[PDB]
Design a protein around this ligand. Sequence first.
Ligand SMILES: [Mg+2]
Lengths: 129, 79, 123
Amino acid sequence: SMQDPIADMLTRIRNGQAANKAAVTMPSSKLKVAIANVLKEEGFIEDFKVEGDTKPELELTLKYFQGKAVVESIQRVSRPGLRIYKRKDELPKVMAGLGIAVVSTSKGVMTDRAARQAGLGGEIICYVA
Amino acid sequence: KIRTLQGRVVSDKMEKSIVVAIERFVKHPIYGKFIKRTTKLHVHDENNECGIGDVVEIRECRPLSKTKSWTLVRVVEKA
Amino acid sequence: ATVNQLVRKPRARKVAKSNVPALEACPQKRGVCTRVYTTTPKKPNSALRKVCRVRLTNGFEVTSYIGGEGHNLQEHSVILIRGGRVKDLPGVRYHTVRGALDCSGVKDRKQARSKYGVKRPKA
RNA sequence: UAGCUAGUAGGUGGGGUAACGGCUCACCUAGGCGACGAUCCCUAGCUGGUCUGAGAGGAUGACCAGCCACACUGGAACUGAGACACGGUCCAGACUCCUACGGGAGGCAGCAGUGGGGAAUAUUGCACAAUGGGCGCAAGCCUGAUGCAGCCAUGCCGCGUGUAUGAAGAAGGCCUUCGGGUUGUAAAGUACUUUCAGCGGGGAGGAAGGGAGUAAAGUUAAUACCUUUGCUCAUUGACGUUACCCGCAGAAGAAGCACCGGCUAACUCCGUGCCAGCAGCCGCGGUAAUACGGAGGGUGCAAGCGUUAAUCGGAAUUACUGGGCGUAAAGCGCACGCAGGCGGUUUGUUAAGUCAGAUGUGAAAUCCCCGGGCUCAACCUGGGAACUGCAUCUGAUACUGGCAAGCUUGAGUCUCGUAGAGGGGGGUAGAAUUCCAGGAAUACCGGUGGCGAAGGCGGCCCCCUGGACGAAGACUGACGCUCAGGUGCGAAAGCGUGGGGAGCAUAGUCCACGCCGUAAACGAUGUCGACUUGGAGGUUGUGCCCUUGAGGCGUGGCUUCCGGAGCUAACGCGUUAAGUCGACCGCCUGGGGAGUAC
Ligand SMILES: [Mg+2]
């Protein structure tokens, strides 16, 4: 990317959700390992392998259950220059809470249940559905 | 001790008196954007011990002159 | 638009103006009867209508339609205006209070009385 | 409206106020504020909240409550704890008033009233009985603040104007195809009850204090006096011939108003015939008007109903949650860029951004939820929640941000070649072409080529210069992308000054020095970056491969031509986007008047 590494990643993934390729790959900062170690665990994709040490870079495995593809409607919201630092008792539940809401907390990125369990919100990263 | 408001020096063409701007973020009240806004307030100091371009710690004081109600405490930056 | 195009200048309005300029924030103004004119409407209509130009009290002079079923106007006395423009005649953007100071009612309507100077007939 | 400002901006000093002070007077210093909108002209009192909106947001500031400003119009002060002083003084005037002409009085932006301008907004009311105020040792005085009463459907929430039964489906009205139908169980007539108003009689609480007596452990002469506590009588309301309860008549006093073509709930007939007329838009009327006028019947609402005026809503129709620009209004003709906005990649670190935790604080009253009181409801009300806020301590380090340290892909310099109407100057000169000499500029290549940021630029060779490209290496370590103003380059003509005159429009066209910035200056498609089915041709390279070749597989770059998904109102775009996005800039919000008035 030039001027957001995480926004321009989220174009790269769901273009794989429009031709149903197997593996996708983007140049991977240490933040970017902490991105898809949430999407795997909540079940939206399957497996990933970092590789490279002068170009640290990922091998994400997609997940399309049918002709239907699992990662339906992912959206970045906090785009740079429009930071929305949510207080935690405003929190965006995604699609009546049926999805997950990736929030950049202190204690990590892994965020469904920061509403009650962790107990501190922050900058939204992206809605996920 | 109030907050020890950090600021800069903009100009010194005055007799024992300086001009301080202060960096300051804010939510823009209707759009939700962060505009870096700065103010401009005259500050009393005697020794001319800070130069044009430093970084200054400031508390309030008695209103000495017109247009100037802040004394220097100390300086944390050379020119 | 971009956020930093709405910042340095706000969203300006879409300004709305008044089309009853005999307000002065009022609903009814008094008038002293310049003439009675009998001009004609446009192409889809016929049958020339009854209008009067009116000398107001704010300082203006403007025209007004004298509807009903026949009128009673010697032309050096008082009327009262209502607004609510006629579509037909070019320039008449008013009405008259049918039954007011010096401009009495119409000769015996019996449906929709109150919008003209017709009161309860006999009972 | 882009410049403003000298007591202006600052410092020693005196002087000055209750207080810091340029608050003033001499002196020195030469500043101060400003695109994060100063001076300027126009307009306006500000908030808690009211209205509307699901929300954000939008117009509002009347009432009750907070805070300033002003007392006929300009001034200055005196007293005072407090004023630059509404029912005080002085200086003027101005109106206004009065005068023996010499002079004196005047101020409803107090309540109640007149004139008047007005669409229109009320009584020359009663009481100190309440709660507050002032003065007091209280008594009490005083209070056009408050407590009340008249005025007016201006608004809100009740409430009645009767309920049963009843057809022969009555006379009656209009419709009628003359079979009838409908009004209509409607009425009549039998049953039945009097709310409220009429009228009659008793009849809560808003009243505690105060004053009088009489008791107490009071402190002092131990019982004088007084202060406090408890007891006893008399008491004390404007409203108010009160609220409410009770008594008797007799269906008895009590129903309008708009619409009826479409949106929009309700229809048929007479009269009129593009005349009279309706109307919010669509529109109706020129012999059969479900729209005009009238009559029956219907609809909706109701003691009001319509009309007009006024704000939001529908309006995603100024869009932050919630828009758009290839043709529907809309991408500056094009370039670098200043202040602005925005970060590759790793570690350290700080804790401002933000999250968390409390502690302050957000006046009470409205809004909101459980709960009380008026016979219910409006309304009055107890407690909560909420007031989305700002300031402080403690905590958190993932993102972001300043400081410190790095690494190679963004970018950038070098080497090295390659292709080319990129220009500037200098002269050159014909495949061609009028006059008696020379003005012009390409025939060919010439094209879907090719250059450049665009307008653009084509003879030939050299000269100074401009950009891109490829093959490798090398090192710089974020050094970048974008742009309001800003400054350049700017098709024709026109014009200026200095000449010419053929091809041929009589200057001008042509060179040149200066203005002029204009246009289909129309990819009618800002810019950079990364991603996604493609297929055939263009042209520039250059790696591998018997190069064994004109040639294959790659692999660079830009430009064509048709087309998937996706998208678009279509038409269509479609790896050079308009498709999925991110950062930033320009611009539009119905047509005419108008690229015009000043
Ligand atoms: Mg009583």
